[PDB]
């Protein structure tokens, strides 16, 4: 199928953005680590380990954003080549973009689940000791549901703007993505560690985007 090609191009592109986003998030986590290194006088022996121990922490933020940035760049470049506009002109439907995303978002989601189901707790427990000594679930669960939403959300946000701007198409998709993430990050504030849970607005905002994702996709 062409869908297999759509994924193979995206996966070859997401796997490149993933390295690029890993480096970008490496520096941010290294800056925070280095800042804590000079503030708390944390020894240099394990600063590298902490960088390699916060990877699941960054993974929650990049794995959706690596697929999304991959989807935006791939669909950006495919539309910049005027390939998508023929992909619909040849009898395929916009569902092909969606089904291509989902059949590749199930992968990223499954990996996102692994960074949520196992690597998350795995990261923190190793992060607690680092040989130095010598609720969340509503945010935890919405991370997987983010991938399916954004893969559904990116496919309408990249094919109407590139008529005039190569990167100006990404901005509304990125800003609408950013308004999702910070608001989702903002809401996961009240009732954190422990059994106390945040009020019912985190999934209310998250479900809002899914409705907003379907709303502009059906055109």
């Amino acid at each position: 199928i062409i869908i297999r090609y759509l994924v193979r191009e995206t996966l070859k592109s997401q796997l490149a953005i993933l390295f690029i986003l890993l480096l970008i998030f490496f520096c941010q986590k290294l800056v925070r680590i280095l800042g804590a290194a000079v503030d708390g006088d944390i020894p240099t022996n394990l600063v590298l380990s902490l960088l390699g121990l916060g990877i699941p922490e960054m993974a929650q933020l990049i794995l959706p954003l690596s697929l999304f940035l991959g989807l935006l760049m791939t669909l950006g470049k495919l539309y910049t080549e005027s390939e998508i506009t023929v992909m619909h002109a040849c009898g395929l439907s916009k569902a092909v973009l969606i089904k291509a995303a989902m059949i590749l978002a199930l992968f990223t989601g499954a990996v996102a689940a692994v960074n949520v189901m196992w690597a998350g707790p795995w990261s923190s427990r190793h992060q607690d000791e680092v040989l130095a000594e010598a609720a969340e679930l509503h945010w935890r669960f919405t991370l997987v549901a983010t991938v399916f939403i954004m893969a559904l959300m990116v496919v309408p946000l990249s094919v109407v703007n590139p008529r005039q701007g190569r990167v100006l198409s990404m901005l509304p998709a990125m800003l609408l993505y950013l308004v999702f993430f910070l608001l989702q990050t903002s809401i996961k504030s009240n009732g954190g560690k422990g059994k106390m849970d945040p009020a019912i607005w985190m999934w209310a905002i998250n479900l809002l985007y899914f409705a907003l994702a379907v709303l502009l996709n059906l055109w």
Binding site: C27, V31, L34, G35, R166
Partner: protein, 225 residues
């Protein structure tokens, strides 16, 4: 006149880019204040904290990172509309464009140093009062080298707009500005604190790798001539 037009293009792009990026910096950290809200007030953080919250983020961080992204998006926006090539094909010297854009950094370092000596430490220190050596030395000398960094970020844009422009799409230049403008970021908060780790003396090194962009802008200026 042709240099003055370069000034508005390059300077207006730098100023607008700085403003949009500063809005992003504000609300991304504003929601951080919403996270810390409940001490007494968040609407007050919206009004009183926000104004003195915005100005500091420019000088130590978002000004030079948006300075490169200002010209490399702007001075490449002229080459995006083939303005630069006609500007050069009319005989405006290639060494005069660098004498044009960098001459518009003199009004831009004053809008940085004076916004980094009278309101960046006066406002930010006032901003945290609204929420009621190994470290300083490195930073302080670096903050004196702040005019040189925006003059080099602006000098990096000249090489990136006269070297690797290769009829690129504006988008590519943006991510070049996003990336080297982020490389300049990581090289300002990783290499700067690493200075004490490797024992690089301030009297000789410190934030010079951040200003070693010059040596990254000097192998990007004669490489193809």
């Amino acid at each position: 006149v042709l240099d003055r037009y370069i000034g508005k293009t390059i300077f207006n792009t730098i100023m607008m880019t700085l403003f949009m990026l500063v809005s992003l910096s504000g609300i991304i950290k504003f929601v951080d204040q919403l996270k810390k809200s409940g001490q007494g007030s968040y609407d007050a953080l919206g009004a009183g904290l926000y104004t003195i919250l915005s100005v500091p983020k420019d000088i130590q961080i978002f000004f030079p990172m948006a300075a490169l992204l200002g010209a490399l998006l702007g001075l490449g926006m002229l080459a995006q509309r083939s303005e630069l090539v006609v500007m050069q094909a009319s005989g405006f010297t290639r060494l005069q464009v660098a004498l044009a854009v960098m001459k518009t950094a003199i009004p831009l370092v004053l809008l940085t140093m004076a916004i980094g000596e009278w309101v960046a430490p006066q406002g930010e220190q006032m901003a945290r009062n609204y929420r009621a050596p190994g470290r300083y030395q490195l930073n302080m000398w670096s903050k004196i080298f702040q005019p040189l960094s925006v003059a080099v970020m602006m000098l990096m844009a000249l090489s990136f707009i006269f070297g690797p422009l290769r009829s690129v799409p504006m988008g590519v230049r943006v991510v070049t500005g996003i990336s080297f403008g982020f490389i300049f970021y990581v090289l300002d908060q990783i290499f700067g604190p690493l200075t004490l780790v490797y024992g690089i003396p301030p009297i000789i090194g410190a934030l010079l790798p951040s200003a070693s962009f010059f040596l990254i802008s000097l192998w990007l200026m004669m490489r193809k001539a």
